[PDB]
């Protein structure tokens, strides 16, 4: 895979690592729809609203299978550690109008 998953479960926003690279989700959108990170960086999404959201990378993007993240409730977080340079598009499973990408460089 081109990502590893610290926690299969969402976790609390206060449990996000110090100095984490955070993408907030609010207004049914990713607030940073294009994020550039380095190989080895961990990205953390944090849902800032009540409606549940996830991140979903279709098959072939981060690995052979789709990486369908867990649904995050308000003030829950989810992290992925990116291990290979490339451009990785994602969307929210129930809300596929909401799209983003991580560019790993
Ligand atoms: Cu959503």
Curated annotation (Swiss-Prot):
Residues 1-105 form the Plastocyanin-like domain. Its cofactor is Cu cation. It comes from the Bacteria. Pathway: One-carbon metabolism; methylamine degradation. It is found in: Periplasm. Keywords: Copper, Electron transport, Metal-binding, Periplasm, Signal, Transport. GO terms for cellular component: periplasmic space. Its main location: periplasm. One of its GO terms (molecular function) is copper ion binding. Cu cation binds at residues 53, 92, 95, 98. The keyword Nucleotide-binding does not apply. Binds 1 copper ion per subunit. The keyword Oxidoreductase does not apply. Primary acceptor of electrons from methylamine dehydrogenase. Passes those electrons on either a soluble cytochrome c or to pseudoazurin. This is Amicyanin. It comes from Paracoccus denitrificans. The gene is mauC. The chain holds residues 27 to 131 of 131 of the full protein.
């Amino acid at each position: 895979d081109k990502a590893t998953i610290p926690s299969e479960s969402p976790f609390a926003a206060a449990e996000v690592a110090d100095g984490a690279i955070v993408v907030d989700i609010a207004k049914m959108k990713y607030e940073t729809p294009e994020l550039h990170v380095k190989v080895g960086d961990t990205v953390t999404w944090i849902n800032r609203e009540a409606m549940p959201h996830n991140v979903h990378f279709v098959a072939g993007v981060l690995g052979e299978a789709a990486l369908k993240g867990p649904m995050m409730k308000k003030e829950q977080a989810y992290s992925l550690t990116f291990t290979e340079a490339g451009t990785y598009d994602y969307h929210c499973t129930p809300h596929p109008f909401a799209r983003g990408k991580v560019v790993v460089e």
